[PDB]
Design a protein around this motif. Sequence first.
Motif, PDB file in Angstrom:
ATOM      1  N   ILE A 252       0.878  -1.197   0.000  1.00 16.86           N
ATOM      2  CA  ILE A 252       0.000   0.000   0.000  1.00 16.86           C
ATOM      3  C   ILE A 252       0.901   1.228   0.000  1.00 16.86           C
ATOM      4  O   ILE A 252       0.520   2.207  -0.646  1.00 16.86           O
ATOM      5  N   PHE A 253       2.050   1.159   0.688  1.00 20.12           N
ATOM      6  CA  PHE A 253       3.052   2.257   0.736  1.00 20.12           C
ATOM      7  C   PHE A 253       3.793   2.275  -0.601  1.00 20.12           C
ATOM      8  O   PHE A 253       4.417   3.304  -0.898  1.00 20.12           O
ATOM      9  N   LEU A 254       3.769   1.164  -1.337  1.00 22.23           N
ATOM     10  CA  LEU A 254       4.389   1.115  -2.684  1.00 22.23           C
ATOM     11  C   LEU A 254       3.425   1.802  -3.648  1.00 22.23           C
ATOM     12  O   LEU A 254       3.887   2.603  -4.403  1.00 22.23           O
ATOM     13  N   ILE A 255       2.130   1.517  -3.589  1.00 22.36           N
ATOM     14  CA  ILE A 255       1.094   2.166  -4.446  1.00 22.36           C
ATOM     15  C   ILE A 255       1.072   3.672  -4.120  1.00 22.36           C
ATOM     16  O   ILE A 255       1.228   4.494  -5.048  1.00 22.36           O
ATOM     17  N   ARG A 256       0.907   3.999  -2.841  1.00 23.00           N
ATOM     18  CA  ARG A 256       0.874   5.405  -2.383  1.00 23.00           C
ATOM     19  C   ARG A 256       2.164   6.116  -2.824  1.00 23.00           C
ATOM     20  O   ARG A 256       2.074   7.186  -3.452  1.00 23.00           O
ATOM     21  N   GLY A 257       3.308   5.521  -2.514  1.00 19.49           N
ATOM     22  CA  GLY A 257       4.621   6.088  -2.872  1.00 19.49           C
ATOM     23  C   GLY A 257       4.743   6.303  -4.372  1.00 19.49           C
ATOM     24  O   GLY A 257       5.184   7.375  -4.785  1.00 19.49           O
ATOM     25  N   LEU A 258       4.351   5.306  -5.163  1.00 19.57           N
ATOM     26  CA  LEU A 258       4.430   5.405  -6.642  1.00 19.57           C
ATOM     27  C   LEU A 258       3.456   6.458  -7.159  1.00 19.57           C
ATOM     28  O   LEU A 258       3.757   7.056  -8.216  1.00 19.57           O
ATOM     29  N   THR A 259       2.351   6.686  -6.449  1.00 17.91           N
ATOM     30  CA  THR A 259       1.340   7.697  -6.851  1.00 17.91           C
ATOM     31  C   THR A 259       1.745   9.086  -6.348  1.00 17.91           C
ATOM     32  O   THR A 259       1.027  10.045  -6.704  1.00 17.91           O
ATOM     33  N   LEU A 260       2.824   9.210  -5.568  1.00 15.54           N
ATOM     34  CA  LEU A 260       3.316  10.522  -5.091  1.00 15.54           C
ATOM     35  C   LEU A 260       3.929  11.306  -6.245  1.00 15.54           C
ATOM     36  O   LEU A 260       4.374  10.662  -7.212  1.00 15.54           O
ATOM     37  N   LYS A 261       3.940  12.644  -6.148  1.00 19.32           N
ATOM     38  CA  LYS A 261       4.546  13.527  -7.188  1.00 19.32           C
ATOM     39  C   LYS A 261       6.064  13.359  -7.150  1.00 19.32           C
ATOM     40  O   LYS A 261       6.610  13.015  -6.083  1.00 19.32           O
TER      41      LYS A 261
ATOM     42  N   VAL B  87      10.186   1.634  -2.499  1.00 24.96           N
ATOM     43  CA  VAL B  87       9.195   2.376  -1.657  1.00 24.96           C
ATOM     44  C   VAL B  87       9.905   3.539  -0.953  1.00 24.96           C
ATOM     45  O   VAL B  87       9.260   4.579  -0.746  1.00 24.96           O
ATOM     46  N   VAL B  88      11.163   3.340  -0.585  1.00 28.42           N
ATOM     47  CA  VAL B  88      12.006   4.349   0.111  1.00 28.42           C
ATOM     48  C   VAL B  88      12.490   5.407  -0.879  1.00 28.42           C
ATOM     49  O   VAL B  88      12.837   6.500  -0.417  1.00 28.42           O
ATOM     50  N   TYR B  89      12.620   5.067  -2.171  1.00 26.77           N
ATOM     51  CA  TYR B  89      13.149   5.997  -3.211  1.00 26.77           C
ATOM     52  C   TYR B  89      11.983   6.776  -3.817  1.00 26.77           C
ATOM     53  O   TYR B  89      12.226   7.918  -4.199  1.00 26.77           O
ATOM     54  N   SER B  90      10.808   6.178  -4.003  1.00 26.09           N
ATOM     55  CA  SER B  90       9.587   6.929  -4.380  1.00 26.09           C
ATOM     56  C   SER B  90       9.415   8.133  -3.416  1.00 26.09           C
ATOM     57  O   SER B  90       9.226   9.257  -3.896  1.00 26.09           O
ATOM     58  N   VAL B  91       9.558   7.911  -2.118  1.00 26.70           N
ATOM     59  CA  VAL B  91       9.416   8.974  -1.083  1.00 26.70           C
ATOM     60  C   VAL B  91      10.609   9.935  -1.157  1.00 26.70           C
ATOM     61  O   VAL B  91      10.367  11.130  -0.995  1.00 26.70           O
ATOM     62  N   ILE B  92      11.828   9.448  -1.384  1.00 25.73           N
ATOM     63  CA  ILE B  92      13.061  10.297  -1.454  1.00 25.73           C
ATOM     64  C   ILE B  92      12.958  11.256  -2.636  1.00 25.73           C
ATOM     65  O   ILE B  92      13.431  12.392  -2.509  1.00 25.73           O
ATOM     66  N   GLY B  93      12.446  10.776  -3.756  1.00 23.84           N
ATOM     67  CA  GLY B  93      12.253  11.620  -4.937  1.00 23.84           C
ATOM     68  C   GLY B  93      11.038  12.498  -4.796  1.00 23.84           C
ATOM     69  O   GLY B  93      11.015  13.550  -5.455  1.00 23.84           O
TER      70      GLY B  93
END
Lengths: 32, 597
Positions: B232-241, B316-322
């Motif tokens: 869910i944090f992968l979907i949310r993270g991937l859907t982040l700007k 998931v950690v790099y989606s958030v870092i970017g």
Amino acid sequence: PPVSIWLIVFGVVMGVIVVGIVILIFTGIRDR
Amino acid sequence: VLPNPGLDARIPSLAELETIEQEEASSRPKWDNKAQYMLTCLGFCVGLGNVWRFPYLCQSHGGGAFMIPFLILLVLEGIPLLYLEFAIGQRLRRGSLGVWSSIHPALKGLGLASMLTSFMVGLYYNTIISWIMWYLFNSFQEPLPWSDCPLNENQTGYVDECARSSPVDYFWYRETLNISTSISDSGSIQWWMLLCLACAWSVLYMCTIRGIETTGKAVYITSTLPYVVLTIFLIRGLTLKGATNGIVFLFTPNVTELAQPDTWLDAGAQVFFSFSLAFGGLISFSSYNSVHNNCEKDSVIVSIINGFTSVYVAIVVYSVIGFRATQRYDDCFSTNILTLINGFDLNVTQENFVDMQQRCNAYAQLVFQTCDINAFLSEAVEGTGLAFIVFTEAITKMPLSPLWSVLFFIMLFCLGLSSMFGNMEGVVVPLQDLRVIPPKWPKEVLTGLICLGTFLIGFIFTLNSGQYWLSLLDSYAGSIPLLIIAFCEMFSVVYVYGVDRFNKDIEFMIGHKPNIFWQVTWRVVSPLLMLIIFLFFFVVEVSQELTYSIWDPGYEEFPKSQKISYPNWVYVVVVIVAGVPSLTIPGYAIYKLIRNH
Ligand SMILES: *[C@@H]1O[C@H](CO)[C@@H](O[C@@H]2O[C@H](CO)[C@@H](O)[C@H](O)[C@H]2NC(C)=O)[C@H](O)[C@H]1NC(C)=O
Ligand SMILES: CN(C)C(=O)CNC(=O)/C=C/c1ccc(C(F)(F)F)cc1
Ligand SMILES: *[C@@H]1O[C@H](CO)[C@@H](O)[C@H](O)[C@H]1NC(C)=O
């Protein structure tokens, strides 16, 4: 906030865990 | 191959092995279901250690640069030792301390180094759990407590630290740690940290009250929930700007990082933390299986899952870092656009800014920041900052901040608790098999004495300097023993117990005798890698001044972290944490070879 909200969450969690702890010990004392 | 006398009548025979299986019906604990065993292995090898340290190692070094060596050693060094830990536990029907003494009575130091190592890694993890659940307790308030600062006397500004630093920085360093200036400066115990630590130890005791007849029921919620929240944090993270800007950053590595000695040294150490190898828990857990369980299939399944989860967690950690980096880049720009829009009283959006700024040419008086995005991506995070200053700040931007926050900490708490089940398994069982407490006392008495013991030892990580204290165990200090034990475990099962006898026993259980891949690794490849790795550790990591990052509000470029050298007396603490369990393997042997003669 009149009381820090973490303390009343901490309290619920700690209460439930100590109740669990006493239940499990008595369960083990009654299964022997 | 080494001259072992009368190995049999110390170990069970294959005939007795097929029969004693029934003799162990009540004599020993047994897994109720294979599911229950697989979930335990999943948590011990795919919990904190695989999901906590990995993204920190990936963020440090290079993104994708560090992932290549890790997956090379995961199979060329980790799969072999994982298959050797599972098979030997299943054959000798005894825990770590039992399996090593049985192979040779002078190898009992190998099961006490494993017990000490397990103890220390639990002491480390428990603290992380305590911080997690501090954060989890604070995440039930619509405006999360780290989304703003306390006001100053003027009420027009926030606490200087909070003002110069970030709200999340002030909630971590001041409101949670109340961190001091130096490891040397050590204040009183922060009562709320002590209270959360008590909660951590209390929950763990409740889940491990009665060995594996209580943890097996726990791993039904504790090894599933963490993987149904991380997708869910992968979907949310991937859907982040800007999230896809960080994923590419992870998959566009600098090859010059792969040609650095230090990258490999960190990957090897990391293999033995990803899979909880040399903690001795796995040997014990595999010893409660059926004697005819296919442990080759289990090792390969665990390894695949463990390898594939490492990459899923860095995505998931790099989606958030970017995401954060993109936000910071947008701000920098926006703030730059504001500097000139106000100064020249003027349409300065993205493309116009570059062309218009040239037209504006108060330019000198105007001060402009440098926005790069790549620089934002290539900005390392202070140890434990990825969870408490990068993921927390990103959630505060999410629509239902409290929902996510809660879920994020419940996932980290569960995969921590899971990890702690094995860590505690590897200290209770050795302590039973020393017969140290009178055996009339129930199992619950011994499990509480170690919970309180490690609880009392954990007061050092509750002081003002506690975080500094905890960052010492992130040094080579906490890694030297793992390499020594893992190598000794491989050497003892191959050149002491005999790989020929080992192969025959494997054939008796699973049915077939292990493939050439297993032969080429166990015999030469695996041992050599370990030799070359720990020697490189001694030549690079150990041969380096130990320095740590201090948080001093009264420091030039305060917001910038200050790196200082440790005071000389902390070499005593490192010398001890590293030798205590590393010199145990030699130093109990020598004891057994001067008492016998
Ligand atoms: C990829 O890895 C190389 C090697 O570690 C990095 O090169 C370093 O770059 C910094 C910044 O210019 C220098 O201060 C170091 O001395 C370099 N190290 C070596 C051994 O050359 C490189 O920076 C990494 N990635 C990037 C962002 O280029
Ligand atoms: C200092 N050190 C040696 C560490 O090991 C620190 N680890 C961290 O700070 C780990 C963060 C982390 C954040 C999010 C996730 C997610 F992907 F699960 F969300 C995983 C790990
Ligand atoms: C923090 O520590 C200082 C001593 O370093 C102490 O005076 C203060 O009361 C503590 N409380 C805070 C600010 O969390």
